[PDB]
């Protein structure tokens, strides 16, 4: 018997906001929320319309929730232009400890 | 003449997700996205139905965007029970350098 926290796969949720400053500064903010995973080790990657996204994204350092969990957010600013081309944006989350590969897609 | 980045007020956006793990684990995830502020100094506070929220929330460490900007996220898990009581949740963002007090509200 060796105790320990069960590894758990991240809960992944992709969210959009297009408010006024956002619409004005000619961009659109997407949040890839990744929460509830243990251990911390994750790989995050963004795609547009099948194909990868090279830059324009930051991922926050993870925080430890009250659940002995980790949450973090991956932040992508997408050109407002590029938002109604009927573009599909996806983030993909990898968690080796749980052998988990996750993805959520979002479109205009 | 002394150069420097103009102080800029945070763009504030409150977002909800209620997916399956979320609906199952009997909670609902709210994200208070705070992006595009300089300097970093901010105060974040959550409320429910006028009245403050004591705990259940983590705020990520801020990241430096490509704009010489800071973005961070404040993460609140709200009881699914507490979500359709027609409860209003608000986060409030303070930025002294810009003399800015911001708030966004969200409900079920």
Is some CB atom of chain A closer than 8 A to the CB atom of B50? no
Contact A47, A92 (CB under 8 A): yes
Reported resolution, Å: 2.4
User: Which residue shows structure tokens 């990520």?
Assistant: B60
- Nearest CB partner across the interface for B31, out of A19, A31, A61: A31
Q: Within the 27-46 window of chain A, which residues sit less than 8 Å (CB to CB) from chain B?
A: 29, 31, 33, 35-36
Q: Which CATH superfamily is domain B1-108 in?
A: Immunoglobulins (2.60.40.10)
| Size (chain A), residues | 108
CB within 8 Å of B1: residues ≥ 6 apart: none
Q: How many CA atoms lie within 13 A of A10 on its CB side?
A: 30
- Alpha-carbon distances of B36 from A69, A84, B8, B42, rounded to whole Å: 27, 23, 7, 12
Contact B86, B106 (CB under 8 A): no
- Record: contact A60-B56, CB cut-off 8 A: no
Cβ neighbours of B65 in A, within 8 Å: 58, 75, 77
H-helix or E-strand containing B79?
Answer: strand B70-79
């Amino acid at each position: 018997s060796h105790m320990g926290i069960p590894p758990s796969p991240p809960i992944v949720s992709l969210l959009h906001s297009a408010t006024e400053e956002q619409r004005a500064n000619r961009f659109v903010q997407l949040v890839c929320l990744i929460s509830g995973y243990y251990p911390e080790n994750i790989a995050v990657s963004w795609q547009k319309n099948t194909k990868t996204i090279t830059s324009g994204f930051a991922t926050t350092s993870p925080v430890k929730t009250s659940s002995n969990d980790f949450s973090c957010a991956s932040l992508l600013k997408v050109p407002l232009q590029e938002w109604s081309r009927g573009s599909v944006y996806s983030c993909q989350v990898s968690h080796s400890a749980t052998s988990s590969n996750q993805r959520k897609e979002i479109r205009s």
